[PDB]
RNA sequence: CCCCCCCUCCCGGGAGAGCCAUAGUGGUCUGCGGAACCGGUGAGUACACCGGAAUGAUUUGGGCGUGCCCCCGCAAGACUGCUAGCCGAGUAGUGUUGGGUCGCGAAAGGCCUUGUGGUACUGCCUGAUAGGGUGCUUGCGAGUGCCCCGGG
RNA sequence: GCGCAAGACGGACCAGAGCGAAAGCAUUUGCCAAGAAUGUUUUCAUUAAUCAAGAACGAAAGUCGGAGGUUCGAAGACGAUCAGAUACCGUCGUAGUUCCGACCAUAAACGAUGCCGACCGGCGAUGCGGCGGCGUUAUUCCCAUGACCCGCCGGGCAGCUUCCGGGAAACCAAAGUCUUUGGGUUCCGGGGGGAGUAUGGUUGCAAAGCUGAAACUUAAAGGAAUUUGGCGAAGGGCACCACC
């Protein structure tokens, strides 16, 4: 295209591009809250956790480290935090 | 590595000018780039530009118009006197009716005509016509 | 081009679009056709936006009616899909037709018997008719083309996004182009339907011709 | 790209534009200072401390919630290690490579990598000498690498 | 290791080992042509007539 | 007396996990008001004692992921699973590559309404009329046909 | 046809696929050390790029000292071929080819194209890592992992097209952004021979490696492309001044 407005693009183009090639750099990671079905302790787990985080009480394992995003165990429902 | 940010900025501006684009994205800004673009605005070669302020190093989006032939940067910053400016005028400009030399004087970044008007000289930056 | 309220695409035209298979295109997508595409779906078929097609058709109709000599518009179709359609278009609006075997040298070689020097050019396919496109470059002559989602855009000026593969859609574009040009010129009233039949512009295989001759009287 | 490799990488962290403390975080800077002191008493590097805090305790950075970084806090309290951690890791890797070459003399590629690692060690040690973190009489050698961990 | 020669030859007449390999390896990468291509014999014990007449009836 | 098969054609009856309706049910999702908002206590999933506080007197179900999760009453919707009388019963057995709340899947016997219509098909094996292999036909390429039985 | 012994090598799978700074690397398993890319809201904070002196690695052949020598095979012994054949061809065959320990530092070591950084068209695939989404399968339910399918992102070997642009052209998405000439930096060439030759220094046991002239002689030597012509070059046809 001969004329492209780079001052404000569409949001799906900002989502599509690399995290460093945007007009303003924004990370693709996020913070979230998980809870066990049995034990009731809401904790904060990073998306790319890269480590074994444990509940307060040491009963159930929350996540396993992977190459990218961490693998939450079955039954531990989650939702994204924002403000 | 990246050693001359202004030369890269004018190289990208000249490349997108030859390509025919209407907007140029300069990734690293500087105060020198802002003064150079302000001079090119005030002499009517580029349009209305922006500074994309992030917290590391800002980006600049330049609205282009079809009035620019070439933007160049002389490297390194050769010191030039008032009697040595005419040599640069004959071996750098395409004509005497137009063309400007941006030089870094102690009174600020300005063109050669204002440098002759304020009776001062400095170091070379670049040229545009 | 469609900015007025009388220049809106009416009820029957959308039905003709959906029955002629205009809204769906080919498999590949040209990068000049990013804006004339609504979205993609299953089995690799791109959806052409009908409103932008209407805007480009009105723009091409304005460009055609803008000149005052109707014989100075030359319309070329060399594929069998648009042989009779451009003939009916030239009979309707007064244009000059070329139907198959465009000889390389009409617009440039000045001593030929077929030396044509028009002012505006309409062609039905940018890809198969690459010979009038490069010949239109040597003279100051614009070009309006019926372009697909995969047709390359070079030396074109008004690109109407359509399905130029089926004969029904091609005949529908030529019929509405003649209709809109005659409506802008003033020969055809804007509110009374001058619609004779759209099938006079439609190409068919000859097997269907003997089939219709056997099934009819 | 890299310094001793022909490849080019673009894998690094990208901080958000907002440098403000989020409203959902309920940790006052003295509590995260206490947690940093506890993890340092457990014997961890500042990088691993930042990893554990970011993964478990929900903080983004210490520096966005406290006016100092992790190493600055550890130097203010007075329990930071006497050697930088990257130069220590490079010395440990060079010791492991030299231990590999004590029994395998046919591995020319490992000798090449040992030369590269020692060049990186000297290049970092020159900068740490000019920044006055290391004493001026410090010198990386073979026999000095065995006594140091 | 839990069979002697008779029923393992009976197992070698069809490709039951091949079908078991193809079924077991489906979760790793699916195979389609698995056949036991060669069976050799390294060591042979002392010759006993009774096993020969049990192997012929 | 051309005595053996074998292929096809007209029509009809059975077994099997097809589709469209029908009866019995079971789940996921959806909106409305918790007399109005800020904290302290014993683990806090629905929890209970209160202090502030709103209209002399009275008082509004919770958690901390501050915005959707529980428990309520109302209102009917969209989608899906099983059975083809129902209960026995998802019960043994079987199963894996890693788990689960787990697929496949019986009969004995008993209470009644004695058990809902149309439309097709079936080479052989494996693990369903699915899935994945692989044949018969004339040498090829493409079609028809290759479950059991009865009359010609 | 059944067995024994010796040494060498790892076909088919094997690709304009992978790794390594280059030379180079292909049976299975086990041990040790190392590395690119991807992911990161982790840490230090300018630690960076190119490089006289100096330093590691470095195909095959060649040298010194051992063990072993299956096949192949410089020198050599013959048999044909030919006017001659100490050549092509065939049979043997010594060093060498293999491993260990010590040497040289040479290739058309070629992408005949230095390294770092930025910008300028499109498309379909491919190897790795990550992300998202209808469906099929590891037999019918759920989740995650493998295997397919549709796309995005980053790095890498590459491909097709192009009046971007360049060039003497072949061609190149770099060999582009070059009279509109300046991003940073190392090495190197000034007509063809003499000549990588003489001499001096230096390294090596040796073969040889690095540095490296001058006298004299010459008007051309070369690069790309077009036309003819002739090929013991290929593909189609013809002729009793060609053949059967």
Please name the residue that has the structure tokens 């009374």.
Answer: C192
The CA distances from residue B54 to B121, C149, D63, in Å, are 35, 39, 18
Eight-class DSSP state of D147:
H
User: Which residues, in sequence order, are bridge partners of residue B59?
Assistant: B52
| Statement to judge: residues D60 and D87 lie in one domain | no
| Statement to judge: residues D55 and D72 lie in one domain | yes
Burial of B60 (0-12, 13-18, 19+ CB in 10 A): buried
User: Which residues, in sequence order, are bridge partners of residue A32?
Assistant: A45, A80
Q: How far is B33 from chain D (nearest CA, A)?
A: 23
Please name the residue that has the structure tokens 């480590």.
Answer: A51
| Statement to judge: residues D92 and D69 lie in one domain | no
What is the interface size between A and B, counted as CB pairs within 8 Å?
22
Question: How far, in Å, is the CA of D106 from the C1' of nucleotide G97?
Answer: 23
The Cα–Cα gap between C87 and C76 comes to 10
Strands C143-147 and C120-123: parallel
Q: Which residue of B has its CA nearest to A7?
A: B61
Q: How far is D142 from chain A (nearest CA, A)?
A: 35
Residue-by-residue DSSP string for C155-174: S-SEEEE---SSHHHHHHHH
Phi, psi at A53, each rounded to 5°: -90, 150
| Statement to judge: residues D88 and D65 lie in one domain | no
Phi, psi at A13, each rounded to 5°: -70, -35
Decide if E15 contacts E39 (C-beta within 8 A): no
| Statement to judge: residues B74 and B11 lie in one domain | no
| Statement to judge: residues B1 and B40 lie in one domain | yes
- Lookup: tokens for B55: 């917290």
| Statement to judge: residues B53 and B80 lie in one domain | no
Nearest CA-CA partner of C53 in C160, C178, C144:
C160
| Statement to judge: residues D96 and D113 lie in one domain | yes
- Chains B and A physically touch (3 or more Cβ atom pairs below 8 Å): yes
Domain-ending residue, one of B32, B47, B68: B68
The CA distances from residue C28 to B102, C40, C94, C152, C195, in Å, are 50, 11, 36, 11, 35
Q: Whole domain around residue B74: which residue ranges?
A: 69-129
How many CA atoms within 13 Å lie on the side-chain side of E15? 12
- Shortest CA–C1' contact from D59: which nucleotide? G41
Decide if D50 contacts D62 (C-beta within 8 A): yes
Residue-by-residue DSSP string for chain C: ---SSSSS--HHHHHHHHHHT-SB--SS--GGGSTTEEEE-GGG-EEEPHHHHHHHHHHHHHHHHHSS-GGGEEEEE-SGGGHHHHHHHHHHH--EEEES---TTTTT-TTSTT----SEEEES-TTT-HHHHHHTTTTT--EEEEE-SSS--SS-SEEEE---SSHHHHHHHHHHHHHHHHHHHTSS-SSS-----GGGG----HHHHHHHHHH--
Decide if C29 contacts C152 (C-beta within 8 A): no
| Statement to judge: residues B1 and B63 lie in one domain | yes
Please name the residue that has the structure tokens 């295109």.
Answer: C25
| Statement to judge: residues B41 and B92 lie in one domain | no
| Statement to judge: residues D75 and D125 lie in one domain | no
| Statement to judge: residues D120 and D89 lie in one domain | yes
Please name the residue that has the structure tokens 């030529």.
Answer: C174
Q: Is residue B5 within a helix (H) or strand (E), and if so which, with residue range?
A: helix B5-19
The Cα–Cα gap between A71 and D26 comes to 26
| Statement to judge: residues B44 and B75 lie in one domain | no
The Cα–Cα gap between B27 and B60 comes to 7
User: CB C126: neighbour CB atoms within 10 A?
Assistant: 23
Whats the size of chain B, residue-wise?
Answer: 129
Is any atom of nucleic acid chain G found less than 7 Å from the CB of residue E30? yes
Whats the size of chain E, residue-wise?
Answer: 57
Q: Whole domain around residue D123: which residue ranges?
A: 81-149
The CA distances from residue D13 to A19, A23, A48, in Å, are 9, 16, 12
Residue in A3, A5, A23 nearest the CB of B59: A23
Is any atom of nucleic acid chain G found less than 7 Å from the CB of residue D133? no
| Statement to judge: residues D91 and D64 lie in one domain | no
The Cα–Cα gap between C15 and B58 comes to 53
Residue-by-residue DSSP string for D74-139: HHHHT---SS-HHHHHHHHHHHHHHHHHTT--S-HHHHHHHHHHHHHHHHHHHHHHHTTSS-TT--
| Statement to judge: residues B16 and B55 lie in one domain | yes
For residue A4, which residues of chain B lie inside 8 Å, CB to CB? 21-23
**Chain B CB within 8 Å of residue D10 CB:** no
| Statement to judge: residues B55 and B89 lie in one domain | no
Domain-ending residue, one of B68, B90, B111: B68
The CA distances from residue C124 to A40, C67, C145, D52, in Å, are 69, 20, 6, 66
| Statement to judge: residues D99 and D49 lie in one domain | no
Please name the residue that has the structure tokens 């799906």.
Answer: A12
Q: Which residues contact D53 (CB under 8 A, 6 or more apart)?
A: D32, D35, D36, D39, D59, D62
The Cα–Cα gap between C35 and C46 comes to 12
Has residue D19 been placed in a domain? no
Has residue D15 been placed in a domain? no
B72-90 as b/e: b if 16+ CB within 10 A: ebbeeeeebeeeebeebee
Q: Which residues contact C128 (CB under 8 A, 6 or more apart)?
A: C78, C79
**Chain A CB within 8 Å of residue D58 CB:** yes
- Lookup: tokens for A26: 């924004």
Is any atom of nucleic acid chain G found less than 7 Å from the CB of residue D6? yes
- Lookup: tokens for C162: 């359509």
- Shortest CA–C1' contact from D70: which nucleotide? G43
Q: Which residues contact C31 (CB under 8 A, 6 or more apart)?
A: none
Which subunits count as partners of chain C given 3+ CB pairs below 8 Å?
A: none
User: Which residues, in sequence order, are bridge partners of residue A45?
Assistant: A32
Q: Please report how the helices E5-12 and E16-24 are oriented relative to each other, as an axis angle in degrees rounded to 10.
A: 70
The CA distances from residue B94 to A10, B20, B103, C60, D102, in Å, are 43, 22, 18, 44, 69
Phi, psi at C190, each rounded to 5°: -80, -20
Q: Which residues contact A20 (CB under 8 A, 6 or more apart)?
A: D10, D12, D14
Nearest CA-CA partner of C74 in C36, C15, C140, C123:
C123
SS3 B60: strand
| Statement to judge: residues D57 and D118 lie in one domain | no
> Is the N-terminal amide bond of C164 cis, ω within 30° of 0?
no
- Lookup: tokens for C81: 């899909």
Please name the residue that has the structure tokens 């069809």.
Answer: E14
The Cα–Cα gap between C119 and C140 comes to 8
| Statement to judge: residues D106 and D147 lie in one domain | yes
Count: domains in chain B: 2
Q: Please report how the helices D70-77 and D29-41 are oriented relative to each other, as an axis angle in degrees rounded to 10.
A: 70
Has residue D94 been placed in a domain? yes
- Lookup: tokens for A56: 């307060």
Residues D125-134: contacts with CB within 8 Å, 24+ apart? D125/D87, D128/D84, D128/D87, D133/D84
Approach to solving? cryo-EM
| Statement to judge: residues B10 and B61 lie in one domain | yes
Decide if C185 contacts C62 (C-beta within 8 A): no
The Cα–Cα gap between A63 and A60 comes to 9
Question: How far, in Å, is the CA of A43 from the C1' of nucleotide F46?
Answer: 21
- Lookup: tokens for E2: 């839990």
User: CB C125: neighbour CB atoms within 10 A?
Assistant: 22
Q: How far is B102 from chain A (nearest CA, A)?
A: 28
Decide if A75 contacts A59 (C-beta within 8 A): no
Longest dimension (CA), chain A: 61
Residues B40-49: contacts with CB within 8 Å, 24+ apart? B40/B71, B40/B128, B43/B100, B43/B111, B45/B128, B46/B13
| Statement to judge: residues B59 and B80 lie in one domain | no
Phi, psi at D52, each rounded to 5°: -70, -45
| Statement to judge: residues D87 and D147 lie in one domain | yes
Strands in C158-161's sheet, in edge-to-edge order, are C96-99, C73-77, C120-123, C143-147, C158-161
Decide if C37 contacts C24 (C-beta within 8 A): no
Please name the residue that has the structure tokens 């278009």.
Answer: C89
Resolution in A: 3.5
Decide if A23 contacts A14 (C-beta within 8 A): yes
In a mutational test of the A interface, the residue from D55, D57, D64 whose CB has the highest number of chain A CBs within 10 Å is D55
User: CB C168: neighbour CB atoms within 10 A?
Assistant: 20
Contact (CB<8Å) B22/A2: yes
| Statement to judge: residues B11 and B60 lie in one domain | yes
- Lookup: tokens for A23: 């007009």
Question: How far, in Å, is the CA of E22 from the C1' of nucleotide G139?
Answer: 15
Contact (CB<8Å) D10/A18: yes
Count: domains in chain D: 2
Domain-ending residue, one of D57, D80, D103: D80
| Statement to judge: residues B55 and B14 lie in one domain | yes
The CA distances from residue B62 to B47, B50, C3, C25, in Å, are 7, 6, 32, 37
């Amino acid at each position: 295209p001969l004329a492209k407005d780079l001052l404000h693009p569409s949001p799906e183009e900002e989502k599509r591009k690399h995290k460093k090639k945007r007009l303003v750099q924004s990370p693709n990671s996020y913070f979230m809250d998980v809870k066990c079905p049995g034990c009731y302790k809401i904790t904060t787990v990073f998306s790319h956790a890269q480590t074994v985080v444990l509940c307060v009480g040491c009963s159930t394992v929350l996540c396993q480290p992977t190459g990218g995003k961490a693998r939450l165990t079955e039954g531990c429902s989650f939702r994204r935090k924002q403000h | 590595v990246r050693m001359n940010v202004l030369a890269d900025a004018l190289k990208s501006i000249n490349n997108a000018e030859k390509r025919g684009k209407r907007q140029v994205l300069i990734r690293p800004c500087s105060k020198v780039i802002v003064r150079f673009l302000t001079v090119m605005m005030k002499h009517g070669y580029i349009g209305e530009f922006e500074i994309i302020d992030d917290h590391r190093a800002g980006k600049i989006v330049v609205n282009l118009t079809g009035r620019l032939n070439k933007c160049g940067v002389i490297s390194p910053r050769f010191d030039v006197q008032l009697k040595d400016l005419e040599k640069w005028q004959n071996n750098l400009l395409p004509s005497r009716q137009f063309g400007f030399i941006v030089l870094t004087t102690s009174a600020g970044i300005m063109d050669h005509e204002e440098a002759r008007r304020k009776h001062t000289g400095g170091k070379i930056l670049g040229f545009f016509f | 081009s469609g900015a007025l309220d009388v220049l809106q695409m009416k009820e029957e035209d959308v039905l003709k679009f959906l029955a002629a298979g205009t809204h769906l295109g080919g498999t590949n997508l040209d990068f000049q056709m990013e804006q004339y595409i609504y979205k993609r779906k299953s089995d690799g078929i791109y959806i052409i936006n009908l409103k932008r097609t209407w805007e480009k058709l009105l723009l091409a109709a304005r460009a055609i009616v803008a000149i005052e000599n109707p014989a100075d518009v030359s319309v070329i179709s060399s594929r069998n899909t648009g042989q009779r359609a451009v003939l009916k278009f030239a009979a309707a609006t007064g244009a000059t037709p070329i139907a198959g075997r465009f000889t390389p040298g009409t617009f440039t070689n000045q001593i030929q018997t077929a030396f044509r020097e028009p002012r505006l050019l309409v062609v039905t396919d940018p890809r198969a008719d690459h010979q009038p496109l490069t010949e239109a470059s040597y003279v100051n002559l614009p070009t309006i083309a019926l372009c697909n989602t995969d047709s390359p855009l070079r030396y074109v000026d008004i690109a109407i996004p359509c399905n130029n593969k089926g004969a029904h859609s091609v005949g529908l574009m030529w019929w509405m182009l003649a209709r809109e040009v005659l409506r802008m010129r003033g020969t055809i009233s804007r509110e009374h339907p001058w619609e004779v039949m759209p099938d006079l512009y439609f190409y068919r295989d000859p097997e269907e011709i003997e089939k219709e001759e056997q099934a009819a009287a | 790209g890299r310094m001793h490799a022909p490849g080019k990488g673009l894998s690094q962290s990208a901080l958000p534009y907002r440098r403000s403390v989020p409203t959902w975080l309920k940790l006052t800077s003295d509590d995260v200072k206490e947690q940093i002191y506890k993890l340092a008493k457990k014997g961890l590097t500042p990088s691993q401390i930042g990893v554990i805090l970011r993964d478990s305790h929900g903080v983004a950075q210490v520096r966005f919630v406290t006016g100092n970084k992790i190493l600055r806090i550890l130097k203010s309290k007075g329990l930071a290690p006497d050697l930088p951690e990257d130069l220590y890791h490079l010395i440990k890797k060079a010791v492991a490579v030299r231990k590999h070459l004590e029994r395998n003399r046919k591995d020319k590629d490992a000798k090449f990598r040992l030369i590269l690692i020692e060049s990186r060690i000297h290049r970092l040690a020159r900068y740490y000498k000019t920044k006055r973190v290391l004493p001026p009489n410090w010198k990386y050698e073979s026999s000095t690498a065995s006594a140091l961990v | 290791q839990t069979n002697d020669l008779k029923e393992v030859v009976n197992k070698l007449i069809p490709d039951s080992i091949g079908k078991d390999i193809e079924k077991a390896c489906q979760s790793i990468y699916p195979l389609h042509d698995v056949f036991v291509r060669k069976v050799k014999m390294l060591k042979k014990p002392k010759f006993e007539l009774g096993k020969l007449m049990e192997l012929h009836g």
